[PDB]
Amino acid sequence: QCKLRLFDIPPGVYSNSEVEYPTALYTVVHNMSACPERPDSYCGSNSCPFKRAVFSNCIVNYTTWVNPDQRDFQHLILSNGKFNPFTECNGLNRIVDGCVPGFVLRVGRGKAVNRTIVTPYLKPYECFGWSWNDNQDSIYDWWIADFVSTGAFVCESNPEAPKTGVCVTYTVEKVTFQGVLYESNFTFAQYYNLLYVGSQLRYVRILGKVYEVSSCFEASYDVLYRNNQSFGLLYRSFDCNQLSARFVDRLLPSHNGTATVLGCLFNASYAPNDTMVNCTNPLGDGFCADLLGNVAVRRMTFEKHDTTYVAPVTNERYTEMPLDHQLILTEQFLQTTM
C-alpha cells in the first residue's frame, strides 16, 4: 500500500518491491596494534617541553586518558554515549564515534582559578578538551589533537572476518556495495584491496582473505496480486534450480519455487502449455498473469491474419477460396498536436 499509495489495491502485477539487509562498515581491512598512552602532563624539575604522542594505525582504549575517579572528568559527558575527549572543534565535526584520521596529541596542565576554563584559538584540524587531574584542588589537564594526515585511521576494535553467504550492504575502503561473499583461491596484486572486472566489483580482500563478490539475487520481487489472501510472488532475477525465512511467514512452502524463464515463481501455477488471447496482465517474454480464479502463469498468443495478395493461376490446380466475409472495424489513433 505504501509503495502504491492506495488503500484498496486492484488486481494486477506490481514490480520491484525490495528486501532489506544488514550493514557492515569497514574503515580498514587489516588488524592493527595498540596505541601509546598519554604522557601525564607532569614535569620533573620546574618546567620542561611537554611530551607528545603520535596516534596512527592503532586502537585507542576506553577512558584511559583520565584518572579512574568518576567525579572529576564528568564535564566531558554528553549522553549515554559519553566517551568524548573534545570540547570545541575546528573545523571538523565534534563528536568522535568510530574512527578519526590519525592525529598527533600534545598534553598540558595549568592551575584552575575562577572554576572557568578558557578556550585557546584553534587552527583548523585542531580540536581540544580538558579533564581534571584533581577537582577539589583545582588542577586541570588538557590535550589538543592535531590531525596531521587524512587517512591514518586510528580505530577501536580491529575488524573481523565477515559472514559468507548472506546479502549485506558492505562499505569497504570508501566504496559501498551490496552482495554476498564467498572464499576464493584467487590472488591479485598487493597494492589493491578492491578488484574490478570492467566496472563491477568482483573481489575484496579482508584480513588477508580474498572474497569474490556476488550479487544477491533475492533483493527484488514482483507481486501477482489478486486480493488480501491470494497473491503470488515472482523473483525475476533469482535462479532456483537448486537452492528463505521471508517466505515461510507469508505462504505455505519454504522451498518449492518453480524455476521459469521469467524467474523463480512462488505460490502461483506455472502452465506453459495453456494460452490466453486477451492478456490484460503481461509478465514479459510471452507470458501472462491470469488473476481471475486463482494465480496462474500462462502463455500469450495472437490472432492470425491473412493477406489481400492473390497469386495468379497459371495452371489447373486447387485453390482455397472464401465462402463469406466478416466486416471488421479498426480504430487507429495518431497524435497530431500539443
Added chain:
Amino acid sequence: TNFKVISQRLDKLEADVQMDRLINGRMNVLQLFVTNYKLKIAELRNTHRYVQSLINECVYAQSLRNGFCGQGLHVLSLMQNAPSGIMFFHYSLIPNNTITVKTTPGLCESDELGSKCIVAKDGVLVSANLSYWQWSPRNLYKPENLTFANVIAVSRGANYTTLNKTFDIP
C-alpha cells in the same frame, strides 16, 4: 523561496550558496520541460507525414497497399477528432469460411492450336469437383453457370484446360 529573506537573514557566504540552490534548482525544472517539449515536436514531424498519407490514400482514395488501411479488403475509412490528435475508422472485409475448389486459367475445346478458347470475364473459373466448369467472383466463391457476356473469347495461353467437348454457349 523568497530571495530577499534569504539575503536578509544570512551572511553573504551562506546567502549566495543558497541562492545558487533555488536558481540551479529552478533552471533544471525549466530545462527538463524544454527538452521533453522538443522531444515531442521531433517525434511529430514524422507522425505528420504518416497522417497525411492515411488521409490521401485511405480516406480520400482507394488504396492498393496491403494492410495499410487495416487488414483486408478496404471498404471505407472515415476520420474523427480525438483529444490531442486524430482517429481513423477503417472498415474491411476479412474471410470467414473457406472452400477448396478446382480452378484454371481458361478452357479450350480441343488441344490443337487454333481451337476456340475462353477465359473468365471479371472473375475466375472454378468447378468445385463437378463435371462442368463455373464462374465465380475473384474474392468470393459464389458460382454461376457459363454464359455469353460472362466469358471472353480469346486465343490460347500457357496451359489452358481442354474439355474435348464444345461449349454450350451459343
Added chain:
Amino acid sequence: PKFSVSCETYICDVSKACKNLLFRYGGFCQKVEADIRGAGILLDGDVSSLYSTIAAKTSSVVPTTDRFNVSQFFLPKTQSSANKYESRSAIEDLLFSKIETTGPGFYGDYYNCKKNAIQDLTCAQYHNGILVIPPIMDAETLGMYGGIAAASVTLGIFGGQAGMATWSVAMAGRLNALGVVQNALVDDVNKLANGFNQLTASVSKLALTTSSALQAIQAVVNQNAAQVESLVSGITENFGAISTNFKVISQRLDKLEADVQMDRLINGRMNVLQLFVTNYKLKIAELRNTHRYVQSLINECVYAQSLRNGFCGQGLHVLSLMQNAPSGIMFFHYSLIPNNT
C-alpha cells in the same frame, strides 16, 4: 529492454539522512518513475501491434521447397528428442555470433544470457535498484518462423489463396509476373534456385568491417552497453565529496560542510539518472515511427507483392524473408537487376 527504476535506492541507498534531502527537490523521484513506466507502456504498445502483424495464417498443406534451401537457412532447426530446443534458425544463430559484445560488465552478462538461450533460465538482472525486465514478446529469444507468434513463410509468394504445390511452381509464376519469362521451364527456375542458395550461404561470410547491416546491429549493441555503463559509473564515484557513504560524511564534518558535500553526491547522482531517462525517451520517440516503417515492409514486401519502385530493394522484386536480429528485425530482399543490354 524494459527497465524498472527505484529512484531512492539508486540515489540514497539505505541512508535515512539522504532520503530526507531528496524530499526537498521538486518532485524528482515521482518524475523519474513516471517516465520510465510511461515509456515502458509505449514500447509494449508498439511491440504488441508488431506481433499482431507478424502473426499470419499458414497452409495446412505445406508446399515442398524443391531446390530452394529455405528450411536449411530460415526455418527453426529441427528439434531433437532431447533437451536441446534451438528455437533460432541457422541465419538467426549466425547473426548473434558475429555481433561481439563490448567487454565484461552488466550488459555483457545480459547479452550472453540471450545468446546462449538455456532452457528455463532467467536473464533478468538487478543492481542498485535497477531491474532489467524482458519486453512483452522478446524477439531475442524467439525464431521468426516458429512458435506461437510464428510468421508465415508462404503467405507472400503463395498468396492468400493456398493451393500451389511446390516452390518451383510458385517461383515460375512470379517470374511471369515480373515479365522476364513467358513460361518458365526447369532450367529457368533452377538458375533462380542456385542464385538464391549461393547468396544465402554467403551470409555466413559477412564481416563486420565490410557489411553495413552488421554495423547497424553493432551500433545498437554499443549504445546499449554505453548507457548501462554510465549508470554503473554513476555510483562508484564521489562528485567532489569525500566518500560515498552519507553517514560518514555527516559524522566527520560540521553541518555547513556536511550539507554542501551531501548536495554533491545527490546532485551528482540525480544527473546520471536523469540523463538515462532522457536518452531512454529519445529512443522510444524514435521507434514510434520506425515501427510504422517495419509494419509496412511486412505487409507489402513480405506478405504481398509490391508495386513501389525501390521499396523492397532495387529491381524486380522476387522475394522477401525476415529474420530476428539482436534488438530488431532483419529483412532479406531478393531482386533481379539488369546485367547486359
Added chain:
Amino acid sequence: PKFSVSCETYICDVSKACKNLLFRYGGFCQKVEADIRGAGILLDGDVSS
C-alpha cells in the same frame, strides 16, 4: 555538420588543477565523446545510403 569534441579542452582548458576535478565526476568525459562519435556514425550511415 559533424562535430569532434575534446571534452577536457572545453571545460578545463590548460589547467591541470581543473583536470584533476573532472576525474571525480562519474565518467563524464568518456560519455560526451562516445555520444558525439556515435551520432556521427549514424549520420554517416544515413547520408551514405
